[PDB]
Amino acid sequence: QFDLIRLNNGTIELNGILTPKAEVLTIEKTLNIDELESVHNTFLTNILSHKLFATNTSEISVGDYSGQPYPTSL
Amino acid sequence: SQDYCTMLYEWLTQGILNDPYQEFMTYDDLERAWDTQYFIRKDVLLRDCDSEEDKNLLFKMLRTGILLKVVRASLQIPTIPSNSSDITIQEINDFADLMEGSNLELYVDKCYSRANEIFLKLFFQG
Known part of the structure; x- marks a missing residue:
């Protein structure tokens, strides 16, 4: 039941306020349309966020000794 | 003092801070x-905050509203109803009376x- 966010620093964050139990003093985590699209975009982005595919940016380390983006060599 | 008192009341019975001015x-x-x-505007206080007794009272009022x-x-509610507890508290309808001594402390304690x-x-059930 716990909605937990894993962070890269090891933190597991509860996603929001911890709610009380059903016993109180006095539902489903479904996705909406944008959320579904977002998940999909996130996914494709993640594939292409892998370092080896970053051929459109100066941020890709261009190999090391070859001096080229990994896909050039591949 | 009527609106001031209302503002104080909600702070103390609802935990509501609403101070546009x-x-x-x-x-x-x-x-x-x-x-x-949280900040204490010493300059808008009813009493000094130099005596120990009034500091204690000020903090109690502060804590009261915070817990609320x-x-x-926690409950995702706009308000806490009177039937949420066995303690029901009347509105402040007379500032001067509240300031007569002792009455303020007790009002706050309640x-x-x-x-x-x-x-x-x-916390122990929810």
């Missing part, structure tokens, strides 16, 4: 991130006790 002591940030700093604030946030009753029920 910045006249109330206990202001905070943002207007997540719930552990914000937590409860409202509010404080109530805030703890409600709060603790939540």
Whole structure:
């Protein structure tokens, strides 16, 4: 039941306020349309966020000794 | 003092801070991130905060509203009803009377006790 966010620093964050139990003093985590699209975009982005595919940016380390983006060599 | 008193009442029985003209002591940030700093506008206080007794009273009033604030946030509710506890507190309808001595402290203690009753029920049940 716990909605937990894993962070890269090891933190597991509860996603929001911890709610009380059903016993109180006095539902489903479904996705909406944008959320579904977002998940999909996130996914494709993640594939292409892998370092080896970053051929459109100066941020890709261009190999090391070859001096080229990994896909050039591949 | 009628609106002032109402503002105080809601702070103490609901944990509601609503001060568009910045006249109330206990202001905070943002207007997540719930552990914000509270500020005491010494200059708008009813009493000094130099005596130990009044400092204690001021803090009790502060805590009272905070506990209630937590409860409202925790239960995701706009308000805490009177039937949420066995302690029901009447509105302040006479400022001068409240300021007559002792009455203020007791009014606050009742509010404080109530805030703890409600709060603790939540923490040990909710």
